[PDB]
């Protein structure tokens, strides 16, 4: 079926008491294949990825991981950073390939920000060290992803603290450039809805549960109201979303 993440009917929660956070999540994520999660604010977008890691508590439901669980790459909504060098951040206990490291820092376009740093590559950034921008920290924390040969990338939102130029450099190069080279399963949360043409599967979720999952033609045909809300919301209302 070529499907690595097969969470069926999960009534997941954060707190062990109270109401559950998630309810009846019947999702599928295809292998080698980019998908996108779009929901509203506070509505389960990080919670699906942390339930898929099993960090959130399973009251009911069942998770059907396939190649226990392998090592996944992950970059959170808040960028966690070490007190190491920038190269030791981006490698993160891997073997250092110079050309794979070179195409990651060319793919992220962190090269002028590593050019303006006073030791360049080996500056000890972090808490003990130089404070950063936050956007540069976001690019460093996603630059530690897509390197590990880990084949599942849990890429929570990179496109908060970046502009349109660096997000098109992150969305044409990098995402769908080197992640179409090997068959790495990339999942994204993104409210910049211009990249909704650059998605094969699409998860749309609403208030704990999902609304539907499937492709853009399936949301065009079957859903066709949140599709119209995305058509008004992206403001290319003349064209047809494909």
């Amino acid at each position: 079926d070529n499907c690595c993440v097969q969470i069926m009917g999960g009534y997941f929660t954060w707190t062990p008491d109270g109401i559950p956070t998630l309810s009846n999540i019947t999702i599928r994520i295809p292998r080698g294949q980019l998908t996108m999660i779009v929901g509203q604010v506070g509505c389960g977008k990080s919670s699906l990825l942390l339930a898929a890691l099993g960090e959130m508590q399973k009251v009911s439901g069942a998770v059907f991981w396939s190649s226990k669980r392998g090592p996944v790459a992950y970059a959170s909504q808040k960028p966690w950073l070490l007190n190491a060098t920038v190269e030791e951040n981006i490698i993160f206990e891997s073997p250092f390939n110079k050309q794979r490291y070179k195409m990651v820092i060319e793919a992220c376009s962190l090269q002028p920000d590593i050019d303006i740093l006073p030791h360049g590559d080996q500056t000890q950034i972090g808490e003990r060290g130089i404070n950063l921008s936050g956007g540069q920290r976001q690019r460093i924390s996603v630059a530690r992803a897509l390197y590990q040969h880990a084949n599942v990338v849990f890429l929570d939102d990179p496109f908060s603290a970046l502009d349109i130029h660096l997000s098109d450099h992150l969305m044409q190069a990098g995402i769908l450039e080197l992640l179409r080279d090997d068959k790495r399963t990339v999942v994204l949360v993104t409210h910049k809805l211009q990249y909704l043409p650059h998605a094969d599967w699409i998860i749309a979720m609403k208030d704990g549960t999902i609304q539907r999952e499937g492709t853009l033609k399936d949301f065009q045909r079957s859903e066709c109201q949140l599709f119209e809300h995305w058509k008004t919301l992206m403001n290319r209302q003349d064209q047809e979303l494909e």
Binding site: G18, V41, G134
Partner: protein, 296 residues
Amino acid sequence: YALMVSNYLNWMVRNLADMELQLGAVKRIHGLLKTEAESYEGLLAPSLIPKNWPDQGKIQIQNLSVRYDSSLKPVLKHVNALIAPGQKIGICGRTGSGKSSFSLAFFRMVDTFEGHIIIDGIDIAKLPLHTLRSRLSIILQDPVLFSGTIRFNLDPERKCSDSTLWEALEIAQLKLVVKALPGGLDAIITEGGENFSQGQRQLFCLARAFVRKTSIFIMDEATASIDMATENILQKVVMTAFADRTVVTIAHRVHTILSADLVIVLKRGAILEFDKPEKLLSRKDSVFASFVRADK
């Protein structure tokens, strides 16, 4: 007393050794005691300031080049604006251009090493600093929330009724999920805001900016995190409600700031363009028009 010598010589030298080790903490706290002040008392006397100091925000920028530190370059170049009291200003630009440097120039944290800049006629740099940062309002890209409770995190100065707080939850579109919290008000926001979402943390910070009733709210990229539907809905809500207020907006997305009055474009620390968004979109060679075109 020879037996007193052989029982107390060790406590003499061991108490000398950890006396040196504990007095290193006095040396460290006296080295950190001698830090630099910010000089919170200003040049101008606190009697020319009225009750409504920023009643009509005439932000006249003249030749304002700023600097973060003494060793660094001038980040912003020689810029000029004439900002009306009913105006709404959208500032767009690249990362690394200086647009969130320019929002800190109103609050005197980034050092204005040359420049005239005023609001309502009278100089920003010749002001008391606490009366400057008390009667003005910012909102940042970072959501920083403290521990304790929600009425403290929206009102730490304790002086407000619950109706203006729930009016701020009404104009954040936050009221429905704060009513879905099981206290109504007065539940627990944890250390850094880890009880909620990142967009909900930024919505709490937005509503904490909405409690204060000053006529200047300035806005950094708050809706970088919060999604496009609530960006449209919240942009419509803050454009209808705060009609008097001179709102300066570093918008993260350009398609929420097509409804602005006039637009600053900042590229490499300088104003490239300053006109109508219809004029700068219809010029077709302009970098604001390629910011609209590169988005959609």
